[PDB]
Amino acid sequence: MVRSISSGKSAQFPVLGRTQAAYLAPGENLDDKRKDIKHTEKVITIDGL
Amino acid sequence: MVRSISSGKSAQFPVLGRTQAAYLAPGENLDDKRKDIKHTEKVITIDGL
Amino acid sequence: ASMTGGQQMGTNQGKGVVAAGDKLALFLKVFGGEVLTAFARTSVTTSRH
């Protein structure tokens, strides 16, 4: 997998986490029990001549 | 690999080398870093007859 | 030998900044566009029974 850029020195790609479902009791809060995707990224640096 | 030759007593074949690459640090002179591709001859001498 | 007065487009070279490491820092890092999904996760059954 090749990709090419112009200009800048460092190229960074973001990655995403993917979630997991749950049951909801009747007459109860959903927003109280929730976890975000906590997505973090990773970067490759251009090298030199 | 046989080939025919005329007149002369012996026959030599030149053998090329093989290059290697490097980094040119920013502001670095290219000349001092340069290393030659060495090529060395190799001779088949007839034995007669 | 080596060359001086390079006019390095990088390096902070600002007033009183500490003798900076990275001759290449002060370059923005651009983003590629290659966000990554973490796969479809498929399924099974769903019209098997």
In angstroms, what separates the C-alpha of A26 from chain C's closest C-alpha? 27
Spatial distance between the Cα atoms of B37 and B17, rounded to a whole number of angstroms: 6
Cβ pairs A/B, distance under 8 A? 8
Counting Cα atoms < 13 Å in the Cβ hemisphere of C23 gives: 8
3-state secondary structure of A14: strand
Interface membership of C8 toward B (CB under 8 Å)? yes
Q: Compute the radius of gyration of chain C from its Cα atoms.
A: 25
State the pairing for strand pair A41-45/C29-31. unpaired
Residue C42 near residue A22, CB atoms below 8 Å: no
Spatial distance between the Cα atoms of C5 and B31, rounded to a whole number of angstroms: 18
Q: How was this structure determined?
A: cryo-EM
Peptide bond into B49 cis (omega under 30): yes
Q: Count how many residues are written for chain A.
A: 49
3-state secondary structure of A33: coil
Name the amino acid, one letter, at A27.
Answer: G
Instruction: For residue C24, count CB atoms less than 10 angstroms from its CB and return exposed for 0-12, middle for 13-18, buried for 19 or more.
Output: middle
Residue C3 near residue B28, CB atoms below 8 Å: yes
Contact residues, chain C, for A5 at CB < 8 Å: 30, 32
Quote the tokens at residue C26. 């002060």
Q: In Å, what resolution does this model reach? A: 3.5
* Residues contacting B30, CB < 8 A, separation 6+: B24
In angstroms, what separates the C-alpha of A12 from chain C's closest C-alpha? 5
Quote the tokens at residue C31. 């983003």
- Concatenating the DSSP letter of every residue in C3-41 gives ------SSS---TT--S-S-SS-S--EEE-S--B-----
Contact residues, chain C, for A8 at CB < 8 Å: 27-30
Contact residues, chain C, for A3 at CB < 8 Å: 32, 34
